[PDB]
Amino acid sequence: ALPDFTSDRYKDAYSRINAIVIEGEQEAHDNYIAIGTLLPDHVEELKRLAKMEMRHKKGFTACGKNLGVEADMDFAREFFAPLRDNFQTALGQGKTPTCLLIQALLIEAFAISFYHTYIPVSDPFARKITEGVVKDEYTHLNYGEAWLKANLESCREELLEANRENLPLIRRMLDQVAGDAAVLQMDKEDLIEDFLIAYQESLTEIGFNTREITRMAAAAL
Numbered sequence: 001a002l003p004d005f006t007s008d009r010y011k012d013a014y015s016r017i018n019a020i021v022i023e024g025e026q027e028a029h030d031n032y033i034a035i036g037t038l039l040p041d042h043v044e045e046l047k048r049l050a051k052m053e054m055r056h057k058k059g060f061t062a063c064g065k066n067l068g069v070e071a072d073m074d075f076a077r078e079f080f081a082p083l084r085d086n087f088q089t090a091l092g093q094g095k096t097p098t099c100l101l102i103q104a105l106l107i108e109a110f111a112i113s114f115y116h117t118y119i120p121v122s123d124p125f126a127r128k129i130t131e132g133v134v135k136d137e138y139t140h141l142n143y144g145e146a147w148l149k150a151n152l153e154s155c156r157e158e159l160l161e162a163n164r165e166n167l168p169l170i171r172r173m174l175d176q177v178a179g180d181a182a183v184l185q186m187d188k189e190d191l192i193e194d195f196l197i198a199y200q201e202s203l204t205e206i207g208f209n210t211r212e213i214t215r216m217a218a219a220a221l
């Protein structure tokens with residue numbers, strides 16, 4: 001059954017979920033622009049992806065306003081801090097494959113899972129917004145898949161390390177979001193399933209075999 005979008009219980013949980021999505025979109029914008037410093041020949045495409053993220057950010061901001069909710073941005077910034085720090089560390093070292101795995105694979109798969117799971121239980125205003133967004137994140141996933149696929153033989157070991165270090169952070173994020181997500185009528189098992197499906201598919205496209213992907217997904221433990 002659909003949540004009561006007007007309840008204090010719902011608005012409280014939404015204040016944090018809304019913030020997380022808004023912050024995620026802002027960080028995605030910033031990350032794609034940053035990746036442009038590592039891939040200067042990709043700058044126009046990356047700018048395009050970044051602009052899409054700002055469009056998403058504005059749409060989700062409007063979702064919070066529509067429900068009369070003030071987004072808890074401090075909570076959202078802390079929620080993303082561990083992954084953000086790892087992205088910044090990789091960026092500083094010029095580690096493009098790690099930056100792409102964090103943003104274009106892990107974060108996009110996390111977003112795709114959230115949006116897929118939220119849509120069926122969203123209010124009619126937010127539903128339209130979120131339905132516009134999902135196609136876009138598959139484009140972003142495809143962009144990362146394409147670059148990593150083309151460069152796999154030079155960065156396989158780095159990707160294994162990036163996965164080992166960052167997949168557990170996504171798992172922690174899923175654990176942390178689950179309580180509020182449940183108030184929004186979202187099942188944690190659906191979030192996990194959809195995330196792992198999207199990520200496994202990305203890794204398959206990139207050129208990892210079944211054994212490699214199994215070992216990689218197991219890093220979440």
Ligand SMILES: CCCCCC(=O)O
Nearest residue numbers: 021024025028108111
């Ligand atoms: C769901 C929070 C993450 C959104 C990040 C993105 O749109 O790529």
Ligand SMILES: [Fe+3]
Nearest residue numbers: 025028053056
């Ligand atoms: Fe986005």
Ligand SMILES: [Fe+3]
Nearest residue numbers: 028108137140
């Ligand atoms: Fe995205």
